[PDB]
Amino acid sequence: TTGRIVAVIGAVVDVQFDEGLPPILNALEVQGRETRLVLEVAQHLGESTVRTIAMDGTEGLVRGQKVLDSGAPIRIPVGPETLGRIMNVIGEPIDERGPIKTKQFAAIHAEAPEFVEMSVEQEILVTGIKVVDLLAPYAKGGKIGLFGGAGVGKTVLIMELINNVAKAHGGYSVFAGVGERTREGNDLYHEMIESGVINLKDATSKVALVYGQMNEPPGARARVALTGLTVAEYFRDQEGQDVLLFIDNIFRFTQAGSEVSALLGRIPSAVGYQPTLATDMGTMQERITTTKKGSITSVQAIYVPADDLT
Amino acid sequence: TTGRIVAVIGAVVDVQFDEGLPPILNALEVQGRETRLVLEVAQHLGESTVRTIAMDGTEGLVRGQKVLDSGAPIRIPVGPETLGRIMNVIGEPIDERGPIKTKQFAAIHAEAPEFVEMSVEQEILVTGIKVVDLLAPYAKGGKIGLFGGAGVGKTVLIMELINNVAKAHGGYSVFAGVGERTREGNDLYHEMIESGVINLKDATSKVALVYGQMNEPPGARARVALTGLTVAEYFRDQEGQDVLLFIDNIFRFTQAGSEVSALLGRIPSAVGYQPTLATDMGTMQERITTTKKGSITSVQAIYVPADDLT
Amino acid sequence: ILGADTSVDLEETGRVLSIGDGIARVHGLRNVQAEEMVEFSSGLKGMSLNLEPDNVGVVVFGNDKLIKEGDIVKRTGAIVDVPVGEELLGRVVDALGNAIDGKGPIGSKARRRVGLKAPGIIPRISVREPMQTGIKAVDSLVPIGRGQRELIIGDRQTGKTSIAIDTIINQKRFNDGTDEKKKLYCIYVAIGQKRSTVAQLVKRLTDADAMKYTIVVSATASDAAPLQYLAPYSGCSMGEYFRDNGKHALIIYDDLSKQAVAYRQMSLLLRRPPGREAYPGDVFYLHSRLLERAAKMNDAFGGGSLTALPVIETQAGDVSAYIPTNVISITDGQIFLETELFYKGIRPAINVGLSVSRVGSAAQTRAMKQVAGTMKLELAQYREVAAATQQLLSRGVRLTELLKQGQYSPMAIEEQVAVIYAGVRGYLDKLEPSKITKFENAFLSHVISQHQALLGKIRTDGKISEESDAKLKEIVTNFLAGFEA
Numbered sequence A, B: 001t002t003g004r005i006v007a008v009i010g011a012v013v014d015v016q017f018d019e020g021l022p023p024i025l026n027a028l029e030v031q032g033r034e035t036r037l038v039l040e041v042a043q044h045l046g047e048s049t050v051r052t053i054a055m056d057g058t059e060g061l062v063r064g065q066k067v068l069d070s071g072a073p074i075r076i077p078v079g080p081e082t083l084g085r086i087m088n089v090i091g092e093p094i095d096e097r098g099p100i101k102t103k104q105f106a107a108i109h110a111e112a113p114e115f116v117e118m119s120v121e122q123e124i125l126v127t128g129i130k131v132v133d134l135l136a137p138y139a140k141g142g143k144i145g146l147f148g149g150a151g152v153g154k155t156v157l158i159m160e161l162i163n164n165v166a167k168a169h170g171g172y173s174v175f176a177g178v179g180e181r182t183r184e185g186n187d188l189y190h191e192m193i194e195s196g197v198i199n200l201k202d203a204t205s206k207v208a209l210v211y212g213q214m215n216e217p218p219g220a221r222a223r224v225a226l227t228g229l230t231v232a233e234y235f236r237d238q239e240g241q242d243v244l245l246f247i248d249n250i251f252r253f254t255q256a257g258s259e260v261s262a263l264l265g266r267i268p269s270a271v272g273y274q275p276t277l278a279t280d281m282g283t284m285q286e287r288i289t290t291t292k293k294g295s296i297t298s299v300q301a302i303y304v305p306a307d308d309l310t
Numbered sequence C: 001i002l003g004a005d006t007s008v009d010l011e012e013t014g015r016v017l018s019i020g021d022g023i024a025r026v027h028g029l030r031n032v033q034a035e036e037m038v039e040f041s042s043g044l045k046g047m048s049l050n051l052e053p054d055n056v057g058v059v060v061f062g063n064d065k066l067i068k069e070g071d072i073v074k075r076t077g078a079i080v081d082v083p084v085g086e087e088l089l090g091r092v093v094d095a096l097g098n099a100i101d102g103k104g105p106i107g108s109k110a111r112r113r114v115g116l117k118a119p120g121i122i123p124r125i126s127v128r129e130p131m132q133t134g135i136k137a138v139d140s141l142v143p144i145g146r147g148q149r150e151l152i153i154g155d156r157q158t159g160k161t162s163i164a165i166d167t168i169i170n171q172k173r174f175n176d177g178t179d180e181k182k183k184l185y186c187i188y189v190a191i192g193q194k195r196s197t198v199a200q201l202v203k204r205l206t207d208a209d210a211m212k213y214t215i216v217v218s219a220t221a222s223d224a225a226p227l228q229y230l231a232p233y234s235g236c237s238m239g240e241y242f243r244d245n246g247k248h249a250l251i252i253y254d255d256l257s258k259q260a261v262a263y264r265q266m267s268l269l270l271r272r273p274p275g276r277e278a279y280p281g282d283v284f285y286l287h288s289r290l291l292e293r294a295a296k297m298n299d300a301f302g303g304g305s306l307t308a309l310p311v312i313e314t315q316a317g318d319v320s321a322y323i324p325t326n327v328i329s330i331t332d333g334q335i336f337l338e339t340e341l342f343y344k345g346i347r348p349a350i351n352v353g354l355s356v357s358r359v360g361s362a363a364q365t366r367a368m369k370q371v372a373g374t375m376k377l378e379l380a381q382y383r384e385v386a387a388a389t390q391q392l393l394s395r396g397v398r399l400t401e402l403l404k405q406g407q408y409s410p411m412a413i414e415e416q417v418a419v420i421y422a423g424v425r426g427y428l429d430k431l432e433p434s435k436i437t438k439f440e441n442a443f444l445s446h447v448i449s450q451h452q453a454l455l456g457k458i459r460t461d462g463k464i465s466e467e468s469d470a471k472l473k474e475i476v477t478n479f480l481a482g483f484e485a
Ligand SMILES: Nc1ncnc2c1ncn2[C@@H]1O[C@H](COP(=O)(O)OP(=O)(O)OP(=O)(O)O)[C@@H](O)[C@H]1O
Pocket: C155, C156, C157, C158, C159, C160, C161, C162, C163, C313, C347, C348, C405, C406, C407
């Protein structure tokens, strides 16, 4: 069923439907545009109207413009064909190498692993760094946090950990460029082609790239962390492989949330942050974990505003 | 055109009009009052109604009381007849020496000199004082920050700069008393008469005083600098002189702007200051420059709050 | 019976409901697009930011106090854009692209949007060509590559702007020459400054014959906050023209601090939730999308570039503040300037410990790498020793005075390495610190006059060979002996 755009303001867009109102999470395709603009339904305002969040720039949108319902959340490719490729927030390839051909298509939104599905292994991971291994060593299939201010050395540290651990590893790896420098994605991409972990000719790539960098709008940066997360979950659940997840920077997920929160019509929390800071991070973070079947090891770079850990 | 008062909340006064809705910045003459009460239009609330800031006490105002549009901003007396006289924010004399028999009138609000009018060459203003000229010299069309209060010959330095600029460069001066003690205004007024820079007998005075002290409302105090500035702009633009504009002090201009912004209900900025901190200062300080016709050099007193330059 | 007037149908036009707090609420404009430019009845421009059900909130690019209620707003049709081309060179303009220098109309052919998204991963490629500032302390210690983003940061009156000015004046070498690849078109964006300062700035560039390859966008303190907010993006689009058409360009945002407070004004008037220092949540996004557009394009996409030099003003040297840390986390290196060094007379005052540029290091000449390889760490260790090792102080004082440089006088890369070679290799150890400045002037004027072949071989090869090293060794050695007594 078609729907008309009633109001637009930044990333947030209100769409009205006559019949067949779409539920929360569902992606909506906007008509009369060159690039595929996807609106994700966040709230139900009432009077057959829904408040959405755009995954790309909303410039050019007019009131009364048509909006079709896909009938499901944002679906993306998942499988071995995603390895050695670069995906955006809504699943499209952004490396000029045709479509990503896959049988399965996972939705970016999903419930967290249940209590019975959780694992409890605590084997040490030898990184090679003296300060880490001695004082605060990482665990295999564990959640690793790299807190740091502006220009202290998180990207250097996470590249080292990829250089040390990801090369000496049997399973696959997944990098998620969340709201960081775009040239670093270019530096990383060509460096991985140089080393051999990403093979262009063969179908034996060990890394899957996902990018929604700081040039993208907030809606993209708010949902790209879930997109790259879903790619790693496929290998964990269906295949049962030991995955090495890498996010840089996970703060940009929460930072993007505050920008849209203002426009979503919520009462602001402490330091201008969104009131749903814990739950939005909770639903996202809880998915990143080692289940009984598979395993995910996440090294997350964390930005610290104004060198304030509080 | 005539209007009617619809609301009065402190210094803020709403006025509804039938046909002719007055533009922003325009002065409105309130009818049926002992002394002259001027309202300056700030916003257009809609439905033929405008929000205004009072230049004096709003006691005695009734919902339905008539208000006439002057057709322009707060116009004031400007010319050689302002020299030796004291005037308030709205151009009225407050020295009990009869009316200011002026020839021309000039609005307090004025656009800053355009890019083509700017003097590309940086020339020096010879003050005649050895400490100044040598170590920290004054620039024509510049703005100098005077620091210190009593017990250091502050008023004597001010009177000398008036004398020396008038003696050497042949340029008159202006003293804008912004938000300081009315006691101090009385002290200076008589010291200037004692020195000779002001003369009550003949027309050889070198200063035009424009006072709006802390006894007056925030609406008045915010527009006093502009009133004194406009007097200085006459001697530059019409007579082609190197003018000397004193502001005592610039902090009170900033404080008054913060108070006016607060009373309107605008969400405050950092450290309780107004959102329009840079623009309010910018629109005033940019008018103090060198031009093709002349220049206005400004010696501005500064109170640094909490001894904190940041 | 005459037909009714349908000139003000609400489809393509609309009337203003309210105006006061920066925003203009417009009744109508049903077919208008989001972020579309709109024209008011008084010849004033605006942007359709808020599209609500019963109205359209418009950001007024200019003095909003001219607009009244019932004034007719009209659609331009296109998304907020600016004039673009080589016709802007040698012209001073406002954020909208209108000329303010009084030299007639621009006469531009093409136009580009202000809010275009930056190039993705594929069009980009690591920086290769060096962006020569002509400043010894910069080009040796903190070199900039073409396509790089390098933050100039420090307190008020520390020489932030002077670095950008000398960088623009230095490009005359390449632009008045045969090599089209080495040319660099400059764009100085002024945000929140005084008009007198900008007028003085363009005259200085005019006297140095630097304006004819420079665009100047001006949004001074007296201009409205939206114009200051827009100014960087307009100039950025003018830089992208060169970038996309296989040409290299430089852009200087002076400064993004004064842009941030302008955007904070708009957001606080919009009544949006404030955070750190009353700034909104998207002040990072404000500067991020701007700076990302500065990039190095590969040969497939023209082979051009856009180099960004954003400026930031810190209060009391607080680099850990909210806005600095945001711009530090965007750019590919920093150049921090200190009040202490600037007060002593060490100009340009650059903090060698804090200032870095790893991306620009790759795009550096091999000649400069040889002479200024160890110099980075030597100057850092020199500042540590506050209270064999005495020789470190004997070198540190010389190299600091050697890196000192006068204003409005850049140097060629081959001319710089010759001066740095003298101090770093240890041919100025037995000499008074005060004699270092006069030695440089006498030495530089000698080698540029007599030994052109030596300087030419250094530039052409981009390297100090064994024959050039031995040749250069015997100049500084024998020239010193005469200079001494
Ligand atoms: N290398 C230098 N040698 C001598 N004087 C210099 C040098 N660089 C700058 N100056 C002088 O120092 C003053 C301040 O420099 P500049 O305006 O570039 O700093 P700034 O950080 O841009 O200041 P602001 O941010 O307040 O504009 C200038 O008036 C200039 O004349």
